[PDB]
């Protein structure tokens, strides 16, 4: 029958499992310690909390859902984060690699500071690689599902450790012309809009989706050979946005086929360019969301658009441009997870309230695009 010197009642002290790899270590803390000093405790009683220069490490509580996992502050007291008995702690260090595709296209490992926002991430990235110009870059996933709010971290955004992410030059209107004389670039403007306007980012009308897919069979066929270029020939998916991928297109793309002659392929590169360039909707990010319409009981699926300048309702089905509102005459607007509002003060009589899963992507570039102008005037 023996006592133990070692007791302290379950109500005066903090007993918290500190791992560290696979170690883990039981340790008994007064519960106002701060956390820098908990630090301390923990080097002087785990050898393998010494792997390294001390103030690299940090603690880090973890969770069973890890969106929910956080690392702790080093001037707060353990009991500020409400820990009870038999939680569990990481002893970690807070600089973590992470892996991101370059602008041309190599993936780099950059390390990071692990307790911080995806804006700070892409800060140290672009310090790493020599752009001081961050606000024209962005990280997005590589899985509508690749965006990331950049006020927010990648933990609670469900991005894990293992994955890479991509770093993307935002959009920007050329100052240059599309010449013939820098083949090199000409093909890179090329496959871009073309890959833009396949994948469904710029949305078109059917008649010029089979223009585009005109010229694009210029360029990989050479001009038009009605012994060979007959129905059945085209693989359709790989000439038509998703929508548009249908037989009767077929036809329409060897018209246009034929309309270019004997154009080279660098000159169907030039033309394919200046067409895209050409549509209002060029350039500009666009949303499906659902309208109210006046007299009407199901909603109803339009493109909204948002630029450097102005706000625009496209139609879904045609690409006609239906309505433009100037960045000027948006008074305030508001977004959640459903929705997402515009008001216009006394521009118009009610406000524009669309269902949609993106209304924070489109908050953000509204207010991205009118802090520019803001801070143009200033």
């Given at each position: 029958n023996n006592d133990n010197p070692l007791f302290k009642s379950a109500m005066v002290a903090l007993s918290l499992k500190i791992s560290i790899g696979n170690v883990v270590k039981t340790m008994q803390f007064?519960?106002?310690?701060m956390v820098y000093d908990a630090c301390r405790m923990i080097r002087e009683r785990i050898?393998?909390?010494?792997?390294?220069?001390?103030?690299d490490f940090g603690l880090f509580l973890s969770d069973?859902?890890?969106?929910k996992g956080i690392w702790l502050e080093?001037?707060?007291?353990?009991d500020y984060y409400m820990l009870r008995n038999g939680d569990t702690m990481e002893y970690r260090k807070k600089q973590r690699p992470l892996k991101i595709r370059m602008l041309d296209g190599t993936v780099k490992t950059i390390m990071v500071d692990?307790?911080?926002?995806v804006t700070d991430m892409l800060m140290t990235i672009c310090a790493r690689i020599g752009?001081?110009?961050?606000?024209?870059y962005s990280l997005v996933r590589?899985?509508?599902?690749?965006?990331?709010?950049?006020?927010?971290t990648l933990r609670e955004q469900g991005?894990?450790?293992h994955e890479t992410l991509l770093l993307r030059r935002k959009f920007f209107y050329s100052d240059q012309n599309v010449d013939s004389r820098d083949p090199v670039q000409l093909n890179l403007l090329y496959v871009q809009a073309r890959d833009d306007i396949l994948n469904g980012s710029h949305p078109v009308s059917f008649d010029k989706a089979c223009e585009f897919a005109g010229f694009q069979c210029q360029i990989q066929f050479g001009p038009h050979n009605e012994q060979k270029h007959?129905?059945?020939?085209?693989?359709?998916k790989d000439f038509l946005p998703k929508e548009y991928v249908?037989?009767?297109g077929e036809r329409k793309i060897f018209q246009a086929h034929k309309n270019?002659?004997?154009?080279?392929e660098i000159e169907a590169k030039v033309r394919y360019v200046k067409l895209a360039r050409s549509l209002?909707?060029?350039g500009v990010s666009f949303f499906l969301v659902k309208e109210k319409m006046k007299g009407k009981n199901k909603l109803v699926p339009r493109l909204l658009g948002i630029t450097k300048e102005c706000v625009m309702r496209v139609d879904?089905?045609?690409?006609?441009?239906?309505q433009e509102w100037s960045?000027?005459?948006?008074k305030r607007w508001a977004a959640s997870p459903k929705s997402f509002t515009l008001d216009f003060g006394d521009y118009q009589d009610g406000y524009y309230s669309v269902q949609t899963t993106e209304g924070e992507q489109i908050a953000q570039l509204i207010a991205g695009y009118i802090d520019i102008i803001l801070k143009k005037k200033k």
């Amino acid at each position: 029958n023996n006592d133990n010197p070692l007791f302290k009642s379950a109500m005066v002290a903090l007993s918290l499992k500190i791992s560290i790899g696979n170690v883990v270590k039981t340790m008994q803390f007064e519960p106002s310690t701060m956390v820098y000093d908990a630090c301390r405790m923990i080097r002087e009683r785990i050898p393998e909390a010494l792997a390294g220069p001390p103030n690299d490490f940090g603690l880090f509580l973890s969770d069973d859902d890890p969106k929910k996992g956080i690392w702790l502050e080093a001037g707060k007291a353990l009991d500020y984060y409400m820990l009870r008995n038999g939680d569990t702690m990481e002893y970690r260090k807070k600089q973590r690699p992470l892996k991101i595709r370059m602008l041309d296209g190599t993936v780099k490992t950059i390390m990071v500071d692990d307790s911080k926002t995806v804006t700070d991430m892409l800060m140290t990235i672009c310090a790493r690689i020599g752009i001081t110009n961050h606000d024209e870059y962005s990280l997005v996933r590589e899985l509508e599902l690749n965006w990331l709010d950049h006020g927010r971290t990648l933990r609670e955004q469900g991005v894990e450790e293992h994955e890479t992410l991509l770093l993307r030059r935002k959009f920007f209107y050329s100052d240059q012309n599309v010449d013939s004389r820098d083949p090199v670039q000409l093909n890179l403007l090329y496959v871009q809009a073309r890959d833009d306007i396949l994948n469904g980012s710029h949305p078109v009308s059917f008649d010029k989706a089979c223009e585009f897919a005109g010229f694009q069979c210029q360029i990989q066929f050479g001009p038009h050979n009605e012994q060979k270029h007959k129905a059945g020939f085209l693989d359709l998916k790989d000439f038509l946005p998703k929508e548009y991928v249908k037989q009767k297109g077929e036809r329409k793309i060897f018209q246009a086929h034929k309309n270019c002659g004997q154009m080279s392929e660098i000159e169907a590169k030039v033309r394919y360019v200046k067409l895209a360039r050409s549509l209002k909707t060029y350039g500009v990010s666009f949303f499906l969301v659902k309208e109210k319409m006046k007299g009407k009981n199901k909603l109803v699926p339009r493109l909204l658009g948002i630029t450097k300048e102005c706000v625009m309702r496209v139609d879904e089905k045609t690409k006609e441009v239906i309505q433009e509102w100037s960045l000027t005459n948006i008074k305030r607007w508001a977004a959640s997870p459903k929705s997402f509002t515009l008001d216009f003060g006394d521009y118009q009589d009610g406000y524009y309230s669309v269902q949609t899963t993106e209304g924070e992507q489109i908050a953000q570039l509204i207010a991205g695009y009118i802090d520019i102008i803001l801070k143009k005037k200033k």
